[PDB]
Write a protein that binds this DNA or RNA. Sequence first.
RNA 1: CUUAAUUGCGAUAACGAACGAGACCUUAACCUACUAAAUAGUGGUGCUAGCAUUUGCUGGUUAUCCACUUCUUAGAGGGACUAUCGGUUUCAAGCCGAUGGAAGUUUGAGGCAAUAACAGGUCUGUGAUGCCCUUAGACGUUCUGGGCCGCACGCGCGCUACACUGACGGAGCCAGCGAGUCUAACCUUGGCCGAGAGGUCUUGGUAAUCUUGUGAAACUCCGUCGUGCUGGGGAUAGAGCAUUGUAAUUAUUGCUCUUCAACGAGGAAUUCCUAGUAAGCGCAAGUCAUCAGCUUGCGUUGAUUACGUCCCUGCCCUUUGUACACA
Lengths: 63, 70, 67, 143, 141, 206, 80, 60, 145
Amino acid sequence: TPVTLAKVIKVLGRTGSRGGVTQVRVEFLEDTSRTIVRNVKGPVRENDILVLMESEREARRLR
Amino acid sequence: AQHAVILDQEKYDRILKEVPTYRYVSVSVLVDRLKIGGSLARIALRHLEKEGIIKPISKHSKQAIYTRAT
Amino acid sequence: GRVRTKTVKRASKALIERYYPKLTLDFQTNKRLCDEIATIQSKRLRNKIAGYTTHLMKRIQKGPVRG
Amino acid sequence: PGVSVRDVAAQDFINAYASFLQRQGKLEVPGYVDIVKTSSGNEMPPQDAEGWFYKRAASVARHIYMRKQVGVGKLNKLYGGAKSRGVRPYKHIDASGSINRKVLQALEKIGIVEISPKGGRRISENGQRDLDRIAAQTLEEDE
Amino acid sequence: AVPSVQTFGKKKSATAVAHVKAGKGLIKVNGSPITLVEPEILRFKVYEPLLLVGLDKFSNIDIRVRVTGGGHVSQVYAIRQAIAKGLVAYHQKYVDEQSKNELKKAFTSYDRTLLIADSRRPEPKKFGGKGARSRFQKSYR
Amino acid sequence: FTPVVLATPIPEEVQQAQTEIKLFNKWSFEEVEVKDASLVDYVQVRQPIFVAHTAGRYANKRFRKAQCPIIERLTNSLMMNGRNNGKKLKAVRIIKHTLDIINVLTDQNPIQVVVDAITNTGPREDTTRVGGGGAARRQAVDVSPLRRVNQAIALLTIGAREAAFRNIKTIAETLAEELINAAKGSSTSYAIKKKDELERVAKSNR
Amino acid sequence: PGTIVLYAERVQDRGLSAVAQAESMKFKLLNGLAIRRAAYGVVRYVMESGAKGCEVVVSGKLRAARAKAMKFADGFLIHS
Amino acid sequence: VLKISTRKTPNGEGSKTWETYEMRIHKRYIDLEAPVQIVKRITQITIEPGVDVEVVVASN
Amino acid sequence: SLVVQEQGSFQHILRLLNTNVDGNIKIVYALTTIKGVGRRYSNLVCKKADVDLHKRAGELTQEELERIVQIMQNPTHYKIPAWFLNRQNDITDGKDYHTLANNVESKLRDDLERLKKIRAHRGIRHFWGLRVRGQHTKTTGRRRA
RNA sequence: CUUAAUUGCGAUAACGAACGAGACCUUAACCUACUAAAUAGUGGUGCUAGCAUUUGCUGGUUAUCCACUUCUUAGAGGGACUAUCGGUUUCAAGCCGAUGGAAGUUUGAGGCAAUAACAGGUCUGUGAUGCCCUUAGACGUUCUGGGCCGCACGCGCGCUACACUGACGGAGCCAGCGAGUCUAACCUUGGCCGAGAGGUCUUGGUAAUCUUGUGAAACUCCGUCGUGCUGGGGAUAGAGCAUUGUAAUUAUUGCUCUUCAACGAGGAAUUCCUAGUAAGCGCAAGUCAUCAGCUUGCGUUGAUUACGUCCCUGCCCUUUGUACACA
């Protein structure tokens, strides 16, 4: 099982069905310079390392 | 009520086997060992705690953790 | 949320056109400044007013003042 | 360095001083400790048995020498708990003061406390000696 | 007279008055030490200040603490903020300014309102409940 | 420790593990190492709280709640459940006997066991309800380091309340059981339970 | 008998004084005035007085048998 | 402070809203040691409509 | 401070006071699982016969249990005035009596029947299956008897 | 585009003004400054002691006195301004972080809170009373008591334990909003006896003073029990000691003693709520003869979770339809 820890670097607006999600763009420390777009859940700020269970994945606005 | 509500000396013996070499040994923990109830297990660890075996780092109502004789 | 009302806004802009050769970029001093030149009644509004010019004038000397 | 009285070990001091009431034999009792529960709110009895009658007397002498004077009316409010009448809400209803009166009234016949003028019960000079005397023994187990 | 820098400490609605004069260094509350105030755990919580510095500067001053009214727990934060503000007051009245400088820098690098002021207090209960915003269970019909 | 003898008899024992190292009620707070990514700041362990009480003023700020001690979040989630949905003194003393069991079992730093009990105990991805077609099917998303600590201490208290409920098992016993079962994945705490199925979906719905 | 003093003075311009005008206005309507003529007269009376804000909400029927609200206010009338 | 808290609307219906028409009495004091001239002058002159003074002669 | 073991003559469900007394509990609150022998009335019997509140049930002598019989049933004999009884001031001539186990059941239904023969709301509406101690049940009452 | 807000900037076929809002009134915060205060309190000192008996540790005499104004009191004043800097936006209103500070969500926060609509509520506070009925055989009223207090079935308003973060014992023994008699019985202490309650013997207070430091619960200390319709809840019922009151039953409550109800975590559902907030909790009161489980608040102890969006509800607003105006 390949675990990835990506540190947040930019925010692109908070989405959410009820308004509890954000369109966040991160960049894992594992071979930096590669910024993959994903989504977060709770309180987020740039420079926060995530615990996403995937390397290649991406979703748009949540409704 | 069923098992460990009375005294019957027999229990007290297999218990003198629970107190020593035990890292975590307290009043109601040896009561879960099916042997004795938390009633008489109280004055039991107050006559064997003065001996040294169980080391008291706690001491209030209900909760009171004991260490092994080391 | 903090954004002062209209009453005070209009008052202070007029002070810049009739007191520019003076007017300090400090509020703790511009406090007693607005106390003698104009007539007020509110203690709370009094502070928002003086803290307004310290704010305005400071960024006034930014060059182009179309306001 | 020395010592006072408020610098004493809380509850282990009030337990050793009640055992002193029964000892000297200077308690004088008409007989009623067992049948009552010192409160119109108290429901269950003690897990101590021989006591709470002399424990009650030792505690009153404490808040007598630490302040001015006290009686039993202040103790009916000071020892008044909340009585739950089932699902019907609690209440700070005065406990019972029958004990409280014959408590320090018998400690008067001996010379542990005295009768304060105007109101309350003051502490006599023979009382100060005996009260700071038990403080000495509980401190001989301390410093 | 006796040279004592009288100060105080409180929270929500309690009362405490601590003194810091030039004596044999103690902490007696009507004649009792801070090492017997209880409730056992909050006893170690009140020593905390006299730990990051040490009861070394408390070996030359008589502390006179007293508390009444309010609450038992409300008196916890009361007795400690009364003697903490009282010692920094003896360093402005009988001690030098640069010493009291790294003294208050040792309190704000931990921050526990020892000398600062807590601005939290009960709100205006509404005409519908027991608390503030609290509104009765409106089940409509 | 430089000898201190004046008027009031301050036990030199209490001044020992206090006038030097302001740790816990005799618990080495110093040292400790980060065994996971980030967690720094959102996880304290730099403010040596002697007791389990403090002047809590962190909920008045979004991320200042993260800069709050991690040991305080534990007794905060412990001071609840109807009967004691308030009153901290309760959970505070019983929380002492808990890390004292861990003191005898593997010793270490009491705060070191709680570090692993938040690293692989705080849900990596929480499932939320999002739309697709036919009906509304749930979907999880990457959780931030703050929602790993937050959502952790929340489930950790649910498995400890049902552990000292209907069971002869005491509080400090069930609270130690919670930190110890959180050694690094025992699959016994109620916390790991709900998190295990958050990964179940954070796989067949990625 | 002997400890009571019953005085009497003048009325401070009942123009700006709404309480004193309401007195004679109480019987001005019970005298035989009207509706739009009656209330418009008592208002223009406080206008020559030099008042800031004057409001007089008349609640009743106007030969329509419907008692609605009529705004007989003019000037600078605030509510704060 | 004497605050009479009554139900807002005087009839008994509507929603949940309570009123508290409040009024407080101020009490100052002037402890002196004067004669009867300047003292019986304090109770006769310098009086505002709806004002009284609690004067008690001697100190026993 | 003393561990208590003693002997091993503990008998499950021991009988005394004309009732099937239950065991596996402390002597003091063990007798309190019977209708007649009061919670605090059984408490009186323990101390007033020589029994500690630290002890339990499973040993003791049959001799102590005998005076326990003559004490609860006979109050006017052994120290049990009238306030300690649930039937004080008696109902004949200035004396007193308490209902002990197989005595409460009897006086219960029997004293209420003599008051039903005088024709009174008390026992007559308890006989109809309704309220008697005075209360409002215009709202509640969804289970019944 | 921003704000609790038409707060307002900004933008322009509009210009500049009026009300609501804001501001303001109101409370508590920070007030080692002021009037100073023993009707609040702190300390030293004449005078008596406990324990030091070699620094002192601590009560006492609302005149033994002097001193402060810190604790407390409360009028006059003072203060705070996103103000200080950097990022971000047209280099806008602003935003945000860090700051010290008493305080950076009006500071928290209440009272006011435009015009209008309702055929909202009250003819039952209204001696406001239109229209109406009634007056010797009264719909005004009075006497006895019920009915207002009579319940297969029920919504809704709180509560309760169900246990062990719990049941009990003494013990550590902390409040604020309080609130109290004249030709009289309202706060009633100190008290002797007493199961609670009370009989009986009295003074003090007409009020920061006397009552009474609300000595409350909460919670802590070391113990008793041990998940059992059990000692969990004291049901339910009955003899009994007394207060109010002409009189207590269908009884008003305190409480002594006996017995011991569904309930094993609450059905599809669904309320309050973003910090001294939720919730736990009592006091005096409003109530008021006794009786309140209701409500004012207030002190008291004190969480968790997003800081976003319009998903479900309540409302607002243009693009737009109209064949609707009792909408």
